[PDB]
């Protein structure tokens, strides 16, 4: 179950490596267009903070999710900044979210005093007074409930099905990175002149078994000439021995 559109939740993504393969693998993911960054290169970047907003919207309201879009849901329930960085993913959930009888779960704003700024939070659902005279107590004349329940029935046509949407908003390396893309996988080669790039430590030479001992903390060995000569393989704790060709 995802949070309501008016009750969108902001999930923290940090201190982890985000693999977008499964994000890029699931078939029903159709509306996947990204603006700030290329969608195919999220798996090799470092981001200090990422936000997740999961909710379900109707098909006739998908167009209002793009940044700077103005409409009904985009003005009274949830709005995106004009300089939004990231993108969103929309996929069908008619079989799952919509009951056989049809769910009436999601409530969206109808009447609001003024438009809402992007990423603002509002939870109060006080009734809206239509007329000049304020209305208090119960709903009635000159005051109607500003919330309407979504009707997602199996007999509804295309565009009226529950389409789950997750919003991915993040910065672009503006702080100590907490979310980084997975690093490329290559196999170790021993006793061969290679252009090794251990954790970014570029170099060239042949690597053999090293009888030198590293403490569990120590990572790189240095010689009198003040250059690297031994590296610890991330996959295998065995210590290599860098020497030029």
């Amino acid at each position: 179950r995802f949070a309501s559109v008016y009750a969108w939740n902001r999930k923290r993504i940090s201190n982890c490596v985000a693999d977008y393969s499964v994000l890029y693998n699931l078939a029903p993911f159709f509306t996947f267009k990204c603006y700030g960054v290329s969608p195919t290169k999220l798996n090799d970047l470092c981001f200090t903070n990422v936000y997740a907003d999961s909710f379900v919207i109707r098909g006739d309201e998908v167009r209002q999710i793009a940044p700077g879009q103005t409409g009904n849901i985009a003005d009274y329930n949830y709005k995106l900044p004009d300089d939004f960085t990231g993108c969103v993913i929309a996929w069908n959930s008619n079989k799952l979210d919509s009951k056989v009888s049809g769910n009436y779960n999601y409530l969206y704003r109808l009447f609001r005093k003024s438009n809402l700024k992007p990423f603002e939070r509002d939870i109060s659902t006080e009734i809206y007074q239509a007329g000049n005279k304020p209305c208090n107590g119960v709903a009635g004349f000159n005051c109607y409930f500003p919330l309407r329940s979504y009707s997602f029935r199996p007999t509804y046509g295309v565009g009226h099905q529950p389409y789950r949407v997750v919003v991915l908003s993040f910065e672009l390396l503006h702080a100590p990175a907490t979310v980084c893309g997975p690093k490329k996988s290559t196999n170790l080669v021993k006793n061969k002149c290679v252009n090794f790039n251990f954790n970014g430590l570029k170099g060239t030479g042949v690597l053999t078994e090293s009888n030198k001992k590293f403490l569990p903390f120590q990572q790189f060995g240095r010689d009198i000439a003040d250059t690297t000569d031994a590296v610890r393989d991330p996959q295998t704790l065995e210590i290599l021995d860098i020497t030029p060709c």
Partner: antibody
Amino acid sequence: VQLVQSGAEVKKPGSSVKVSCKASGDTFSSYTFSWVRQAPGQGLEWMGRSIPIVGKAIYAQEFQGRVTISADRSTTTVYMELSSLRSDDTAVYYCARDQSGFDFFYYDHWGQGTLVAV
Amino acid sequence: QSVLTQPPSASGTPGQRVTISCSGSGSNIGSNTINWYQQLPGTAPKVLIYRNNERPSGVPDRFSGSKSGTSASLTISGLQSEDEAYYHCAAWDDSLNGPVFGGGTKLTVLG
């Protein structure tokens, strides 16, 4: 889920009947108590459902809005007033759970019921 | 009065498989699911079967159901004396836009 219901009531035509169905063991703000009436020695007859929030309620074609329902999330009670009464209104009124998945439609667990004789 | 029609009384010996039949319309039974409910005399009606294939309460395995077009069948096996109860068939219809229930079958068990 326990569906506490009001006692049996007898009321003349046009007097109107107020039936209360109580909630226990669960918050009432996101759950609905759909209402159906069964004629004694006869099948169930659908009446409708009410949502505690917003206040929108679905009724049946026969009622044409003659019945009203009030449901407040704090009181955790569904109140049904028939308004119009007749000999056919003599029935046992049963309130039922609505399965799961925000728990709105279908009838999952009926209440003890209240017999109204007109 | 009910859109769905049920027999007025069903009788059978204990331990015998009894079938309860319900007839409606294509837009009522032939379009979506049928549901069988068992009400004990004087108690709250309890959902015996739903979605035409499974049981909501984990009711015993002897209470099976099937839906063929506008017809609904509820086959009960290993009949017992406590099984004597009201059986009701209901379905959602778009013509009336909601659930509608049947006339009810009074399953009775003899000696």
